[PDB]
Amino acid sequence: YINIAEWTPDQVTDWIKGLDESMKGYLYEFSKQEIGGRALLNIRPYELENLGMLRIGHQEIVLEAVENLRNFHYHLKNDNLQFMALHVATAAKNLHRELASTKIDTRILHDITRTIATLKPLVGSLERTPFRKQEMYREYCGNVLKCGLELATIAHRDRLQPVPAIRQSAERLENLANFVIQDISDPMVLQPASLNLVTLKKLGFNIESSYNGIHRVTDIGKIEDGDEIVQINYQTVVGWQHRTVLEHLREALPDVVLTVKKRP
Amino acid sequence: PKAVYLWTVSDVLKWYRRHCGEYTQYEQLFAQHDITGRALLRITDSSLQRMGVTDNRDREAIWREIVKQRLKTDIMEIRDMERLNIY
């Protein structure tokens, strides 16, 4: 059972410790104020400050990690291409509404970075099994990246009439997102993600860790390339640093049980 | 060409002097709050206020530089994803 909302304060500090070396100074206060899983999943900046975490850089370590933890705990059923495209469509429409003379407002520039951010999980999923080796999904990915590059380069001024050009790119990105939502009938885009326990008694895979602490199998029986490791011996590692995930796996002895998120 | 998410606090301070040179008085705020590159990608206008950048004109200028740096990083990451879709 991976009910993060039922985490004891000890499980919270166990997880907090793996985020960054900077967290070690705050574990005592998390335990003293009895921060459980429910309080962790909804933790706010002022509550981090009540715990003595006044450095905003340290707050953002927790908040970024908790945001990944929240997505794993609350929205695993929608962890698929369709709802990634829905996030893209939502951000693009939001950018479009905000646009309704030489200088682009900082707010508009900010909306563009937030819109581009939604492309990253969609594109990342398109470049993994089972979409990676399908010609239509590869062409679709290229169209999304071309539109995203258009948005970013116009915003960076890299490429006369910036607001109408940004508006056209936002509409095109919304249309591209709707291609998955409306035009594709592949059941894979609507398949929920599932968790599987993989027991190892040995083990030749490598772990590629994203910048934000998502750890996937690479360079490789019941484990395939691109599968995300969410626990090692029932310790949740979503959001952990790359180094501490390796340290936890190496110390796990020949007997390691991995909780693995699996690709459709 | 070090990616922003790898920037140390020292890297952020050097970036701040280069792009926010007219606002040197707030440089120590980034050091005191341990604004790494990872933190720089998550700072908002609100967190700059909370850090103590109270002047609206100063904060808007600094916030714009941070957003512009995110766009630069976005362009770099989009090109990396474009190469990953071709190879």
Residue numbers in the entry:
A (entry chain B): 3 to 102, 108 to 166, 169 to 211, 216 to 233, 243 to 286
B (entry chain A): 19 to 105
Sentences reproduced from the published study:
Similar to KSR, the protein Connector eNhancer of KSR (CNK) was identified by genetic means in Drosophila as a key regulatory component of the RAS–ERK pathway. In flies, CNK, like KSR, acts at a step between RAS and RAF to facilitate RAF activation, but its precise mechanism of action remains unresolved. Notably, the N-terminal part of CNK (denoted CNKNT) encompassing the SAM, CRIC and PDZ domains and a 260-residue linker preceding the PH domain can recruit the KSR–MEK complex in a manner dependent on its physical association with the SAM-domain-containing protein hyphen (HYP; also known as Aveugle). Here we show that the fly scaffold proteins CNK and HYP stabilize the KSR–MEK interaction, which in turn enhances RAF–KSR heterodimerization and RAF activation.
